[PDB]
Amino acid sequence: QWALEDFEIGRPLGKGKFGNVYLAREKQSKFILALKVLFKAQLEKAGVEHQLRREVEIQSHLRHPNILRLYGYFHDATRVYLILEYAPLGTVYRELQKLSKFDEQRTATYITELANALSYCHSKRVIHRDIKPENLLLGSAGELKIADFGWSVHAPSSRRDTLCGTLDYLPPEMIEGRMHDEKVDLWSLGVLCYEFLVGKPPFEANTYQETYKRISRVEFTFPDFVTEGARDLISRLLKHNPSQRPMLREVLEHPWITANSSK
Numbered sequence: 001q002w003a004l005e006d007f008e009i010g011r012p013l014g015k016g017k018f019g020n021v022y023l024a025r026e027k028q029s030k031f032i033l034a035l036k037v038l039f040k041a042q043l044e045k046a047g048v049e050h051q052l053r054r055e056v057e058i059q060s061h062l063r064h065p066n067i068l069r070l071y072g073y074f075h076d077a078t079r080v081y082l083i084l085e086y087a088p089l090g091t092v093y094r095e096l097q098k099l100s101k102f103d104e105q106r107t108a109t110y111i112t113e114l115a116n117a118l119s120y121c122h123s124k125r126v127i128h129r130d131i132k133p134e135n136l137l138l139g140s141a142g143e144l145k146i147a148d149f150g151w152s153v154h155a156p157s158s159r160r161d162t163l164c165g166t167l168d169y170l171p172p173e174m175i176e177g178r179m180h181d182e183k184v185d186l187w188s189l190g191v192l193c194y195e196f197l198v199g200k201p202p203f204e205a206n207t208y209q210e211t212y213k214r215i216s217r218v219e220f221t222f223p224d225f226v227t228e229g230a231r232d233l234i235s236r237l238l239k240h241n242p243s244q245r246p247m248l249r250e251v252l253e254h255p256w257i258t259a260n261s262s263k
């Protein structure tokens, strides 16, 4: 097995509520990874141990270029430790901060990337995946990596939206307190896309109530610059009726992705 003793520790990459990810490397190989740390005292008090202990064993087996891989795991006494793949470029969220908006080739490829991943996950009987910008990391050169899994961590920036960034990525069926299925993720996708192009999410608002309203009532508009095929895509994505949303196939088929996608 492994222990904290096989790792050198660099900066914390980000700091979560139940713990942090630090930059790390195995001591022999000097091969770099990321160490997610979890207080476990902070943990069970949220009721999560036994569900974490399986939910590691999904993200352990999962393997894919656009999914951040979990190499191994260990606990000690007071802390739980996820050995993670390191993503050099960090979070799409910061990138979005910097560029203020993305372009179409970016978006379309990221979107392709995302859709590949979920498709794969679906096949493994995995859903629900929470992918907002801050959960998405940028791998070696350009890629996109679904981090998800570990309770979301932050690297200092903004102050703005602290929480109040929550709701925007939730589909009407989740916030309404109904059930949900593979189709949640297609809503999310539609929301990512829009944000990518817009710089803000489709449902952004000053209160959770008004956010909630817009979400469930699917009231969202595009600014000038969006292109019809862009509209077509998100539109076909954000549909109150989960059934009226695609499977990922038609997403990856869609006329506008294939046009501007580098992938």
Ligand SMILES: N#Cc1ccccc1Nc1ccnc(Nc2ccc(C(=O)O)cc2)n1
Binding pocket: 013, 014, 015, 021, 034, 084, 085, 086, 087, 088, 089, 090, 091, 134, 135, 136, 137, 147, 148, 153, 154, 155
């Ligand atoms: N998800 C997520 C997440 C969000 C914020 C901070 C860390 C997270 N988890 C992981 C894990 C492995 N590599 C990385 N790569 C990374 C690289 C750079 C930064 C940064 O410059 O600030 C942050 C993260 N991040």
